[PDB]
Every structure is written in structure tokens, then in C-alpha cells.
Amino acid sequence: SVITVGPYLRLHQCGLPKKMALELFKPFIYGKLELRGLATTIKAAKKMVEREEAVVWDILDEVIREHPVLLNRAPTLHRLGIQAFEPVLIEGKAIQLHPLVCAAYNADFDGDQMAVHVPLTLEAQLEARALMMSTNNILSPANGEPIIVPSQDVVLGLYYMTRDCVNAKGEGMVLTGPKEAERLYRSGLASLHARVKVRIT
Amino acid sequence: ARVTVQDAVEKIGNRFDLVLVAARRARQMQVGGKDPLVPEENDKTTVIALREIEEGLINNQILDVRERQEQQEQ
Amino acid sequence: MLNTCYRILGLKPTVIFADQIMYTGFAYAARSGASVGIDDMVIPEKKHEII
Amino acid sequence: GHIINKGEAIGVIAAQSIGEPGTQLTMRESSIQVKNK
Amino acid sequence: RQMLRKATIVNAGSSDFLEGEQVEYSRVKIANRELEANGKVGATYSRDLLGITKASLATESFISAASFQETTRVLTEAAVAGKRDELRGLKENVIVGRLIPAGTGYAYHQDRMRRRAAG
Amino acid sequence: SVTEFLKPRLVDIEQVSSTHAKVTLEPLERGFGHTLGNALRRILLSSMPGCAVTEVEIDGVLHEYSTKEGVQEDILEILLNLKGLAVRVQGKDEVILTLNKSGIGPVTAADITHDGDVEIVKPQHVICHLTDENASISMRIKVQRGRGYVPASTRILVDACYSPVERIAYNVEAARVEQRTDLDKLVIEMETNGTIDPEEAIRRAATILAEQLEAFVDLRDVR
Amino acid sequence: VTEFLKPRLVDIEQVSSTHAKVTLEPLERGFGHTLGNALRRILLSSMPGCAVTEVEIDGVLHEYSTKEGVQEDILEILLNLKGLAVRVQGKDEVILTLNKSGIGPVTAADITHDGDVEIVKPQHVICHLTDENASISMRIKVQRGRGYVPASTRIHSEEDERPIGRLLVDACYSPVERIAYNVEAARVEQRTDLDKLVIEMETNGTIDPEEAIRRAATILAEQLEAFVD
Amino acid sequence: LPVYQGETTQTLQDYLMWQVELTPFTDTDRAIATSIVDAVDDTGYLTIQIEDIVDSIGDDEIGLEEVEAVLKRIQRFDPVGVAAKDLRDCLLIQLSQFAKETPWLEEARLIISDHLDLLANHDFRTLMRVTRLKEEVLKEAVNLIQSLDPRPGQSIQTSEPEYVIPDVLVRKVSGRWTV
Amino acid sequence: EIKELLKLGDLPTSGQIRLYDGRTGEQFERPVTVGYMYMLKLNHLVDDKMHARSTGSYSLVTQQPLGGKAQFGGQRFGEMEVWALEAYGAAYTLQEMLTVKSDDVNGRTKMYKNIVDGNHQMEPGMPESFNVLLKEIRSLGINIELED
Amino acid sequence: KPLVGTGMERAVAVDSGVTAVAKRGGVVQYVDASRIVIKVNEDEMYPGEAGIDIYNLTKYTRSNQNTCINQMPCVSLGEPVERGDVLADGPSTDLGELALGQNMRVAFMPWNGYNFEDSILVSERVVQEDRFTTIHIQELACVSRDTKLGPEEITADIPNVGEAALSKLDESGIVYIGAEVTGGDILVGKVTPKGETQLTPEEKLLRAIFGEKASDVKDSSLRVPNGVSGTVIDVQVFTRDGVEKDKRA
């Protein structure tokens, strides 16, 4: 799969396009279809999944929801080269990756590929949920520095939104602190405003 | 979806025996014959067992207690 | 920020805090603009005598 | 945030994080100065 | 620590009049031989380090240290000597395809080790 | 089809407090989530009728660099506390309020004189900080009728928050109805200063915008 | 309310047959560019329109070959016909015919005219022929839709239909394709200063500006009224 | 690896084994199904008799009724109707799979039931006289029966020699045969 | 020269231009520099790069799935991959990827049966590649066997 | 054509020989979508020839990398074209200039993270006007490979197949030019003869019932591999001398 940027799609989540889905989970789809009484025979289930009926997409979305998957860069060099996430179904042909983990994965969002792997037994799902998961691999295992470290556009935004030219609109404004967004959005002051007094709890 | 695994980790501490106990728990749930002691919220047996363990009710000991209690009940 | 947040609070607060940091940063970097152009870089006039 | 457990392979965790930074280079009595007191 | 194994010995020490034995092996031998029955028979050893390419070959299991550098030499030496692997290293279990004695599987292997005591 | 549009049905809301609420909708048609959220936010922020304090005439120096005289709290944060007061007026216009209390120290909203149409959502709101002795003080605040906001720099003395809202934000997510996932799901978070139900406030904004646009259709959809 | 002074549609201007300028009455503060943005997004999003759907033609068979006597390739003909702008009356899914022989340019003028089809640009170019003995004869179906729908999506609509010889094209269904707005302040002295929102649109001429603005306002209302309850 | 090595195929029997494995059957039922799968043909008809299968089972319990039930389950198990062991049985299976609303479906079923010999000799007059079928209208039922996919299993079977091993080469050139 | 040419077309010589948001209708500050750029599409497009697989045809030798998209092949796991997977202590996942996903003939059918039956249970068996290794070593005058 | 060039593009376009240039031409007589004729003037004309030059265009032929090479003329009718002039535009060429790509309007600004490191946004308008849309040509082949059991014939008489499957097959078995095909639908119907059998009472009965198949041939038809959908541009057939089947060759 080729890689893209997940601006949404929070940390514990990766974007599986539906085309690769319904193939990896095909035995799961067959089993659940036999469970719901919509397929009395394996051949009927095969015919229906090969016809991509609406119930097939529904049953996929129901079964893949709480089930981890794992992602892997082609040259994996260090500890975090392999990770796991929660799949989220996407209308496309590229797996969407969380932007922070691009630091550990050494990714660059150009022409690139990842391998995907679905753990089968409940045990493998368990160590994927406990050890493979990105919610636990924050600190590095080599030195101790937290691996997730923003350096891109988010940093430029944070730098811009904490500054002051000399004094923006409404230099002498005093507020309580929730009103700051209210006054940036409508009118009255800019984020570049200096000498602004507010109460902080 | 469960976001992080820390509470059951604190309860077990080993970070590996939790995997084994949760596995043996979810196995008996999936094969049947057990009732989820924690209310389910339309979630599969894996995260359900994890939340039940993190609640402070299932471990390597109580599950064995139920096991030999039912074995002697035969 | 993230180092202290993880050390003092725990795991869940620092993870959600990092997520929110990214969300706010993308929002504001899209609101800020922050373009680039030729005149943005300013060549010092002194070079000509220095050279 | 705790002491390390029993059973994990240190040697695999080691010897792998050491070769990670593949960003090195290839192709290669009288003067005493003190800093402070 | 991996660099510091395969110590050579100048003294007989009732263990072996040989060279090229593992440091932990000699430590165990002197612990269970000197303290237990005869502390007078001491084995004076010399710690000699071996490099990466050559320390790896000096391993008790012929299954491992085979794909490392060369298989023909290790196979010939194992055939002539007649060594047994016992599947102790991780790579051995990788080739065989059983639970690695590490992490969640370690306990199982540990139990197996205990289960190997009686029968 | 030709002119059929998907109308929101799932209008479930959930509230944590009486002033906080999170509203979620069902999949809306492409692009309309963003415009609906933006328009609703700006109409509910920049123009809501309401009652607020615009100025006070306290005994002392009209200048900001006034002194304590046992109040032991600078008039600036006193006025900031006055800003966080929700005064509701039923039918009357601009009116004057005044207060007088003993020297116990806890100054709450109940200290003000009670009027027929003047009402306070919460009577425990802090007005002045704990005084040092039995000395009292007269406020002489006034409240008006208006909509939106206007600062006191241009239109005079403290401030004028006619808008009865605290915070507002909108979010757009992907959603699907049957097969296509090109559906917008809109989620709205808004915090209220008080005196109005969040759903009531958004409904009021919807009515205001709807009547503000009805003259554009020129009497359309008669039957 | 305090007399929100509702605006009214006034001074409709038609700069050109494909470019038009619309003005309203003054309104309250904070209401100009919000209306501008909402109306702009709606007019760009879903205004019903009329386009071509598929083409059948006797001479050529598939859309990767040629026909003797014509200058451009068949795909060029399809691309030219996709941009064809035409308005249709109440009934939809209409079919018209085009037949012409000679060496002269072929335009939208020499097409069989029905009472429910109006060509806005008869100066269109439809791949002028070159040979005297060349004679083109072909058919078009024009339908009405609302948004962009490609050729691959409506494959499922025809399984036993579409025999060998009918070539399907893409749909646009967007009759405006460019709009902008501006806000100023004028035309009020007796009351406080008000603002005038002034909207510049450049359609293909198929739809009328007042009709389009009315449709956008109606659809905004039919979207919003679900929130009053 | 890219090195050319044999790729496994269904071989017209692995599909049956996979269907048996996926389908729920008893251990004795599984053994009987394996025995039935052993008695298979490239065309798709059961080579050995049912009594032969019972004898090969070698179990006092193994009865003809259970064997018949297993054979019936296996017949509908695989996507292709197989193990019929009779052209009439295969035609009946095809007709049962066919929709009820068919032209002269009942007439075709009746003809397939016990008028197979009349069709074999193409004795159309005799068939019309015996079955009392409609004249020139039973031809539609005959045509429908013709499209019933005889030997359905043979579709899964595909193999060719692709070898001639030539020894001499003679061809026309310059107007004359040269060898 | 560029600045002078921009004057003839009635453009700001600076090169920036004010841009509004397409969603809020608000004016951005720090005006963005837009332009017209020649841009080209490369041959590495997704419609060929994408590939997935669940279960296909295997090789007669070593019983492994084919590989790189040649007649519906499967992916490749690596030495560095297993180093990392061991480093996590995820022994069970490695066991699955050594037995269930591999040459183990008696494991693939059993796991398919368990999954379609919803059992999610593992049965290891022993890889066929090791049997090939044993047979190949015994081809040389070297005896190798498995003890108890 | 690219807006900003270097001047070498004209030479590199005329020099790859991918376009059709005009040699010793004076004026154009007849123009077609695939054929060009030029009447040379008597100045550049030598005795012994009519005085006409003809260029046959190349339309939608496969390339090595499965891309489409197509050529479009530039002259319309009766244009005086001197020596060395370009006449047709080859792939990615415009008026004899090399041009591979489009001029897109671009803006340099972060947009909610969608341009995170090297990720690129695209407007719907780019898709609408069919910018950056490419044509791919694929090839499939089939041979007969006469065996010991007998020659293999392409007769469209495939056993164990539906009529709808054969609805896109002509008499000989090839597909009508310009038809569409997806999935594993059959292109060429080739059958492999099977060795003769004994009396075989079951098979004899089946042949007396159905006939015309007798399990004589196995289905070896050429079917599109999975995940390929397209439209047939054209088929060709090559037959060795000595065989003159030529059903629709």
C-alpha cells in the first residue's frame, strides 16, 4: 500500500482502504455470514461477497471495528519499525497513516510502501493491543527521549500563534481567558496582541 | 475502543502475564459457557476481557478459583 | 511540553495532549498562511563592499 | 516507568538500537588554557 | 559482555586440559566442584575477548551460528564431533517453529523447562 | 434525485452540565456541514440579543488607578468579576442597580437590590473580594438591552457582552449512508454563560437566520 | 429582533449573456460576508443543470479509432460535446440528432431543433469535416442532474443495455463554475451605517441569476429548518 | 521465489475436500465423505457403487441410509453437481437447481425420470405416444434439458499433452515439397 | 525583469496575493504566493502498486506462497522484521507467522476451519521447510534426526 | 505546452523522430485524421514522379511500457508548408514542442496538514477537465499448439458455459472490435482435444442424449485475469502457411 497523511484519524488509528479490506478478512466475513443466517452454504457466501452487496460492507464494518492490524516499513531498522493500529475504512487506494508516527517510521510520504498484517488468534490480537500499539511506544528504547516529537507545520503554527509584533488590535484588552477565541474569531483583537491581561486558574 | 492499556498493566505489573490471563479469559468467553461479568457495550470479547481485568475482578488467581470450583462441581 | 506532561500526569493525558497539539497546529498553520517569496529573503547590501 | 521485567530479550533490544544511526561518514605540551579557577 | 566469553585456561583444574571453553561453563564448574567436594583443584583462567565475526561461531548449538557466516564448515564440524543442539537459542526455536523463550512465551518455555525436570 | 436533499434526522444531543452541551447530527450532503457550522457559529457569536452591564459609577476616583480603602482588591478585577455576571431583564429598558453590604467579606449577587425585571441566574457569583473591616461600598452599575458585543473603548465604561454565549466550535467528519462515504457529519460544542438552554440558543439562532433569509426566496414553497 | 431591517432583491444587472451582477438591500452588521460565503458555497455545490450523458454514432464504433473525412479524433469530439451548453424544458432525458455533409465547419447551429431544446451558443465547434464525400450523422442524449457524476459510476445502471457502439461520457451538471462576492457600505443615512453585499457571477447562460439565487436560498432554508425543532 | 516451481491447483478434488472440511459433519460422516471423495471421476460421476462404499467402510454401523444422506449432502456441497453416478441423477440435480418457473419444467422432469431410453434412441414419436406430451412443444423441454451441463465436474478438470515429438519436417517451398 | 514584466499584466510586483478561506470566508493574513507551475505525473501510480491477498496458490517446493504479485502472490517477512518482533516479546505472533502463515499444510486448513467457525485458536504443527532441510542434509553423507 | 521553457524543447521534439515532419513539401491538398497528402511544388520537384507525398499516421498503438503513442495533425486544409516543417504532434507534443504535463495554478501554504511533508492537494476542477488523465494499452496473446491428440481449433463452441458469456463472441470465437470486458470473461474460445475413449456406455448414452461435446474438448479459452477491466482496441491473427482456416481472418 502507498502512504498518505492522516490530519484527522487520531493516534490509535490507521486508514485501511476498503479494497484491501474484504480480502484479508474474507474468512471472517464467511464465518460471520454463516453466523447471521444469510449464507446457508459456503458457495452462497462466496457468491454474495463476490457481488459486494450492502450487507457485506455492513458486516465488514461490524467485524473490523474492534480488531487491531499492524503496519511495517520495508527496511525496518529499529524497535518501532513495526507497529499496530485500529483500522478505519477509507474510500480510496492508499493507507492513511498518523502524522506523528512518521517520525519513527522514517517515512517521507513520497513514493513509498508498507506491509500490512492481520493477527489471527485472540492472543496475537492481545499482544498487538498491549505491546504493538502506538499508545504505549512513546519513549525511545535507545536513549529515553519521547519518540513522538512534532517538528513540522504544527510547530510553525504554534510559533506563529505565540508572538506579538509590537501591539496588535486591542492592546489594552483585559478578559477572563475563555473569551480569547471569541475575540480572535469575530473581531477586536489578533493572536499577535501584546499586553493582554487575563486570569488563569 | 480502548485507547491505552495501563490500568490492567498496573494490576498485573509483569506486562506479559496480563496477555496470558486475558487470552485464557477471552478463549473461554468465545468458546461459550461464560457470562460477561462487566456490562458489554457492543464490544468483542478481547477488549471486554481487558476492561474486566482492569476493573479489578479477573486475574490469574480468581479465574483458577472458578476453574477448579467448576471442575469439582462435576 | 510533552516531556513534562508525560512525566507528571501519566500516559492518557499526554497522548491526548499531543493529539490536540497536532490538531491546533494544523488549524493555525492553515489560518496563518505563512507563504514564501523572493523578497522574503533580503540580501545584505554590505556584501558588495565586503566582496 | 518501572523496573524492567523478566523474560524480555535484552540482546535483541540491544545490538539493534546501536546500529540504528546509520548517518556516519566514509572516506575519512606548551599550549595550555584554563576555563575558570 | 557478549565479547567476554571463551576463556582459556593454563591449569588442569580437574575440569579439562583443554582450551576454548565458555566462561559461564567454567564458573559453574568451579562453583559446583570447588565448594562442593574439592576446593584445592583450582582452574586458573584467562579471559580472552573474541570479535563479532569470530565470537558468534563459538556457540554450543550448531543450529545457530550456521547461517551466520558459513554452513559447510559448521556442518562438517558438527558431523565429525556429533553435537546436540537442544534448541536453547532463540534462532533454534525460530528454525524449529515453537514458542520463543521470551516475553509472553517465556513463561511457557520456563514451565516446559520445569516440566523437563521430572518427565 | 433532481432536487431531493438529505435532511438531518439523528439530532441526539448530550450535555455534561446545564451550560455545556455536545450536539451531533446525521450524515449531511457534501460540503454543507462546513457552511452550516460556520454560518451558525458566526450568527450565534456576532449577533444575539441579551442583557449586560456596560458601566459602573463606584464611590471614589473615576480613574482606573484607584485605591482600596479596605476593599483590598483593585477595581480592575472587580470589573472583570462584574463582567462574568448574567443579568436577565424581562421587559424593561436600561436600568440602574446598586448594593450595600456589611463587612463580613463574601460579596455575592444577592447583595444587589432586587428589582421586578432584574434577575440573576446564580446568586453566589463573586462581586467583590473579602473586605477587611465593616466598611461598605455602593456600586451603581447599569444594564442595557442589545445584541452581539461592543467593547468599551469606542462605545462607553467596562464592556458590553450582549451575547449570552461562552464558547462555540464545530467539527466535520466523514460519514456514509449506504455505500458512498462522501457524507458530512457535523458536531457542535458550545458553552453557555447561562439563562438559556443550549438547544434553545441554537434554535433561536436558526430562527433568526431563517427569518433573515426568507426575504431572499420571495415567498417560495407556497405548496 | 430590534428591527433587523430585512433586505430585498433589487437592481438585478446583466453585464453580459454569460456574466451577471446581483445586488440586495442593506442588512445588519456581521451578516454580509456570512451570507456571501454560504450562498457562494451553495451555488457552487448543487445547482441543477443539464448536460450530455452518452453518444451513439453509426460510422465509428469505439472511442479509440477514427473516421475518414473528419479532422480531429473521436475523443476530441466527445470533449467538445461535454462542454456543450443547452437548456431544456420541463421534460428530461431528451434525445436529439445531428446530420451534416460537406467540407464546412459543423456548429451547434445546424442541429435539428426541437421545441424543448435551446442552444445558448450556436458558434460551437464540433470537429469540422475535411472531405467533400464525408457525411456525419449521429445522436446525443441530454439529461439533467445536480452534481458531477463520472462515467464509471453509472456503469452499474446499464448491464444488458449499452450495446457495441454507444460510447459513454462524463457529466458536469454545474452551470455556473465561477462566482465571487464583495461587501461594502452605502445607501443608508436615516439609520446607522449598513452594508451592501454585491455578488458577481459568470455562468454559461443556461440558468438565470435570480432563479439560481432563489434556488440557493430555498435549499439553505430546506436544510436549516430541521434545526428549529 | 521467482524460480519456476509447481503451483497447486484444485485438481477437481481439493475443492470437494475443502467443502467437506468447511461443512459440519460427524467424524464417521467425515470418514464416509472422504471415502466418497475417493470414488470420484474427472467427468464427475461416482466411479464405485454405494454398496461398494459400504463394503469399503467395513463398519457394522455404516448403513445404506447414512451413506445416502452423506452422498446427498456432498452432492449439494460442491458448487458443481457431482457424484450423481447416473446421468438421470445429474439431470435431476440440474433441474432441482434450476428455477421452478421454467417452460415445460414438469414435462422435462417427467421425461428425465423414466423416458431416458426414448431420448437415447431419439424415438420422438414413441416418447410423444408414451408421455402423451404436446406435439412440437415438447421440443422446448428437450432443448431445456439439453442445456443441463452433463458431466459438470469435467469443467474443473483441465490438462493437455502439448507434445508431439516430431521426427521429420516436410513442407512446400519454391513450389515443391522439401523434406 | 520579472518584476517589470509583471507590471505590464497589472499584477502586484511582489508576487503575493490576498487569499480567503474556502470554508470560513475569512481573509488570511501574510498574503500567500500563488503562481502557475508546470507539473507532471510519474509512472509510479497506485492502480499498479496496490496488492492484497488472503489465501492463494502455493509452491510445490517449500510449500510457500508465490510472492511478488505473480499470479496472486503474498508478501515477504524478513530477518530484520523478526528481530523487531522478537524484541517486542510478541512470541505468539511470531509463532503464527512461522506456522499458520507458512508451509504448515495441516495448519492452514485447521485455521480456516476455526476462523469460519469463529474459534480463533492456534495449532502449531511443524514447518515443511524444516523437513526439506532434513531431506536435503540427509542427501549428503550426513545423518540427522530428531530425538525425544 | 509549458509556460516556462528553455528553447531546447523545439529541437528535442523535432529530433526524437516521434512526430511526422514534412520533407520537400510545397502545399497541402487533403487532410484526414490518419492520412496526410502534400503536393510538392515544381521548384522542389524532379521529373519522373507524380508530385505527391503521403504520410500515414500512427493511431493508438502499444508502447513498450504499455502507454499509448498517438499522433494528431496540425495543418487543416490547403496550407503552404515548406521543407522541414512539423505536421503531426506525437505523444506529449504541441505544435512541434515537447510538452509532458500541465500548467496548474498553485499556492504555497499549509492547509490543515494535508501538505504535511510532501503531500499534495488536488482540486476537483483538475479532475473535471480531465487533466493528467492517461491512456494505457495492454496486450494478450494465445497460441494453438497442435498436440498429438489433434489440432486445437477456435470455434466459440465452449462446453459448460452460459450464453451470456458467449454473447460477446463472434462466429470464430474472437470478440467484436470495440467491445468491453471485465473480470474473467472470455476473449478467444480455444478448445483442447481429448484422447478417444472406449465404447463407454455412460459416455455413449451422454453423447446420444447431448452430443456435439462427447467430452472431446476441454475449455482452454483465453479469459481476462482478475482485476483487469478495459475495452478491446483491436485483435490480430497470424496463421502459418499450409493452414487456411481463416474463419474471419
From Swiss-Prot, chain B:
GO terms for cellular component: cytosol; cytosolic DNA-directed RNA polymerase complex; RNA polymerase complex; transcription elongation factor complex. Belongs to the RNA polymerase subunit omega family. The chain holds residues 2 to 75 of 91 of the full protein. Promotes RNA polymerase (RNAP) assembly. Latches the N- and C-terminal regions of the beta' subunit thereby facilitating its interaction with the beta and alpha subunits. Part of the processive rRNA transcription and antitermination complex (rrnTAC). The complex forms an RNA-chaperone ring around the RNA exit tunnel of RNAP. It supports rapid transcription and antitermination of rRNA operons, cotranscriptional rRNA folding, and annealing of distal rRNA regions to allow correct ribosome biogenesis. The RNAP catalytic core consists of 2 alpha, 1 beta, 1 beta' and 1 omega subunit. When a sigma factor is associated with the core the holoenzyme is formed, which can initiate transcription. The rRNA transcription and antitermination complex (rrnTAC) consists of RNAP, NusA, NusB, NusE (rpsJ), NusG, SubB, ribosomal protein S4, DNA and precursor rRNA; S4 is more flexible than other subunits. This is DNA-directed RNA polymerase subunit omega. The keyword Magnesium does not apply. It catalyses: RNA(n) + a ribonucleoside 5'-triphosphate = RNA(n+1) + diphosphate. Its EC number is 2.7.7.6. It comes from the Bacteria. The keyword Transferase applies. It comes from Escherichia coli (strain K12). It is an enzyme of class 2 (transferase). The gene is rpoZ.
Swiss-Prot record, chain C:
Co-administration of salinamide and rifampicin or salinamide and myxopyronin suppresses the emergence of resistance to both antibiotics. Disulfide bonds: none annotated. Acetylated on several lysine residues in the presence of glucose. The RNAP catalytic core consists of 2 alpha, 1 beta, 1 beta' and 1 omega subunit. When a sigma factor is associated with the core the holoenzyme is formed, which can initiate transcription. The rRNA transcription and antitermination complex (rrnTAC) consists of RNAP, NusA, NusB, NusE (rpsJ), NusG, SubB, ribosomal protein S4, DNA and precursor rRNA; S4 is more flexible than other subunits. Belongs to the RNA polymerase beta' chain family. DNA-dependent RNA polymerase (RNAP) catalyzes the transcription of DNA into RNA using the four ribonucleoside triphosphates as substrates. This is DNA-directed RNA polymerase subunit beta'. The lineage of its organism: Bacteria, Pseudomonadati, Pseudomonadota, Gammaproteobacteria, Enterobacterales. The gene is rpoC.
Curated annotation (Swiss-Prot), chain E:
It comes from the Bacteria. Acetylated on several lysine residues in the presence of glucose. Co-administration of salinamide and rifampicin or salinamide and myxopyronin suppresses the emergence of resistance to both antibiotics. Coiled coil: none annotated. Belongs to the RNA polymerase beta' chain family. DNA-dependent RNA polymerase (RNAP) catalyzes the transcription of DNA into RNA using the four ribonucleoside triphosphates as substrates. The RNAP catalytic core consists of 2 alpha, 1 beta, 1 beta' and 1 omega subunit. When a sigma factor is associated with the core the holoenzyme is formed, which can initiate transcription. The rRNA transcription and antitermination complex (rrnTAC) consists of RNAP, NusA, NusB, NusE (rpsJ), NusG, SubB, ribosomal protein S4, DNA and precursor rRNA; S4 is more flexible than other subunits. This is DNA-directed RNA polymerase subunit beta'. The chain holds residues 1258 to 1376 of 1407 of the full protein.
UniProtKB/Swiss-Prot annotation, chain F:
Keywords: Acetylation, ADP-ribosylation, DNA-directed RNA polymerase, Nucleotidyltransferase, Transcription, Transferase. The keyword Lipoprotein does not apply. Residues 1-220 are annotated as: Alpha N-terminal domain (alpha-NTD). GO terms for cellular component: cytoplasm; cytosol; cytosolic DNA-directed RNA polymerase complex; membrane; transcription elongation factor complex. (Microbial infection) ADP-ribosylated on both alpha subunits by the phage T4 protein ModA. ADP-ribosylated on only one of the alpha subunits by the phage T4 protein Alt. GO terms for biological process: bacterial-type flagellum assembly; bacterial-type flagellum-dependent cell motility; cell motility; cellular response to cell envelope stress; DNA-templated transcription initiation; intracellular iron ion homeostasis; nitrate assimilation; regulation of DNA-templated transcription elongation. Belongs to the RNA polymerase alpha chain family. Homodimer. The RNAP catalytic core consists of 2 alpha, 1 beta, 1 beta' and 1 omega subunit. When a sigma factor is associated with the core the holoenzyme is formed, which can initiate transcription. Both the N- and C-terminus interact with different regions of transcriptional regulator CRP. The rRNA transcription and antitermination complex (rrnTAC) consists of RNAP, NusA, NusB, NusE (rpsJ), NusG, SubB, ribosomal protein S4, DNA and precursor rRNA; S4 is more flexible than other subunits.
